[PDB]
Amino acid sequence: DNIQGITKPAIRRLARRGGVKRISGLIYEETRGVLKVFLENVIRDAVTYTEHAKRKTVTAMDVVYALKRQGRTLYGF
């Protein structure tokens, strides 16, 4: 609903860590929304490896292969 997983100071820290000097007040909602989607796409795909491989506990490695499946971005050739 309105449940969030990252705090506003958390967001400024990550922005700072990315080299961002200043941030619009509108960035908080957008960052969080972006984080909802990312998490959805990963968790959904991770549910596959647990449920079609029969288990009830999602392992560390359940998420790992789910992550390997998301497409990896590099910054050169």
């Binding site: 449940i3 969030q4 997983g5 972006v34 989607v37 968790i43 392992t59 790992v64």
Partner: protein, 76 residues
Amino acid sequence: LLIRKLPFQRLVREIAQDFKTDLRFQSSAVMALQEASEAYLVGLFEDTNLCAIHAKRVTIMPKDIQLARRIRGERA
């Protein structure tokens, strides 16, 4: 890790439900999710820095995050 673990854990679990109510994670799994989430959000913000430095626009806008998603391609 720059995100506190407990609130993130609640968000992961509430997402976990809406798919299927019966569902469980574990300490080291949810920590993997978080590690990725921080790396991804940071990646996203490094891109927004590329605009700012090249245009005349130091204050970052939702547009720029949207853009940084499109280049990667799970808006695709």
